[model samples]
Target: MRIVQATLEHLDLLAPLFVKYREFYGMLSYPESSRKFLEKRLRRKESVIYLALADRLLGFCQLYPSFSSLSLKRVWILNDIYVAEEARRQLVADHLLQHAKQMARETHAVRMRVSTSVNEVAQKVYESIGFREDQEFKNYTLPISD
Candidate 1:
């Protein structure tokens, strides 16, 4: 499979997989809303999306930009990544992450981070790609809404 940076034209193929990605994480499958969300990100250039394609979209990974106060450089958050069930075990995620890292490097990012809830499988993929666990800081969050 080849990986390519997604553009507006790929939204038709990209959005469905995005919905599935949310569903895999126990989130609602709001197809229309999800499509709109991706559209906005693309339109505003707020995030970067990479897709693995063969005959169809095999998977996708999206990264949002952030800033590092200490390092004074851009940081990339690998916010969403997912591979179709039929496409798992094919290293689709690995390909996506690799591409994301390459983009981050080209942009002079301080680091790339991933947020996850406790999926051991995802952890394996991250670590295999040289992403180490963050031992330097503990994370906390405040819920603004439910």
Candidate 2:
């Protein structure tokens, strides 16, 4: 299998996988919104996306760039990684994740971060890949402001 970056040219190819990624998060699988989101990210170069292709798009990983002011260094927040159900047990996610790692390391990024809730299976996968926990973080929130 070959892993490669996704661009606007890969929109049609990548959208389905994006849909599945959202669906895994309990989304309702809307292809248009999925494509629109990918378009914005790819067109604006807002995120770095990698796709693993084996006969088809087997899986994908996305990293959104950020910076750590305290450390004065660049950061990569691994926002998503997903492999198709049929593609599990073959380490597709691992391979895709390693691609993200290789990309970040080769670029000399200071750090890459990933997180999970009760995604127990996914947590195990991350642990198997030698991922270690840390106290530092990049958390999230939605405004309740009026």
Candidate 3:
């Protein structure tokens, strides 16, 4: 499969897959919301996404840019990555990850951090690719209720 940077032109093609990805994370199906969400990101240039193509989009990885003001350095948060169940075991995730790192390197990003699930069955996948576990910091989140 071929992985390439996604532009606004690819919005229509990527949205449905995004909905499916969110579903895997316990989100309800919201096709229109998913399309608009991805549309805003692509249109505003707020995120970087790469899609794996094989006839159509088989998987994708998205990175959100951030800065470490303390170090005056740039970093990328690997916010999302997903591949179709039928397309697993074909090295798709590896290719998407490699592309993300390449993009970060091209932009001189100091590092890329991935936000993984609690179980993170693919922890080995990340570590196998040179990502070290950061046990020094504890991440705390405060939920906002409406």
Candidate 4:
């Protein structure tokens, strides 16, 4: 398997994965919208996306550029990381994550951060990768509608 930066040619392969990712996050938009969003991001270079492929998109990691106010330096917010259901346990997720780490280092990011759902198995993969739990930060949100 090869891990590489995502390109326009991989859009179709990425669309379904992206749709599933959104669904996982509770977004109900259609796959076409997800494709357009990803396509625009690629065309505008708005975010850095890495994909693992072995004849098809096996997994992907998407990072949005941001800064840590305390550090006053650039950081990467790893917004999405997903491996195809059929490709689990094959190290595809690991390769995509390692690629993101390498990219963060290359770009001089102060740190990289990600958040996963409480029961996600990917949390184990993240812990294995040396990401410590952020005990100091509490995630709080308020719903706008009932």
Please give each candidate's TM-score: 0.94, 0.88, 0.92, 0.86
Candidate 2's C-alpha runs over 4 A off are: 137-146
Model 3, span 1-146: residue lDDT tens: 79999989898899988999999999998999899989899889899999999969999989898997877889899888888888874389999998888888888887888757655667867775767786755768898995
Q: What is the lDDT of residue 12 in candidate 2?
A: 92
Candidate 3, after superposition: displacement of residue 133 in Å? 0.9
Best by TM-score: 1
Backbone clash tally for model 1?
0
lDDT of 2 by residue, 1-146 (tens): 88999878889988987898898899799999889988999999999999888958888889999987887878888998888777765488878888888887887778888888956777787777657786566568899986
| CA-lDDT, candidates in order | 0.90, 0.84, 0.86, 0.85
How many residue pairs clash (N, CA or C atoms closer than 3 angstroms) in each of the candidate models, in the order given?
0, 0, 0, 0
Question: Candidate 3 overall Cα lDDT vs. reference?
Answer: 0.86
Per-residue error for 58 in candidate 2, Å, reads 0.6
Instruction: Order the numbered candidates by lDDT, best leading.
Output: 1, 3, 4, 2
lDDT of 4 by residue, 1-146 (tens): 89999988889889899898788778895878889999999999999899898977888889998987897788898898888778766388788888888888888888888887775576888886857788867868798995
Candidate that beats the other on lDDT, 2 or 3, i.e. the better one:
3
Model 2 lDDT on a 0 to 1 scale:
0.84
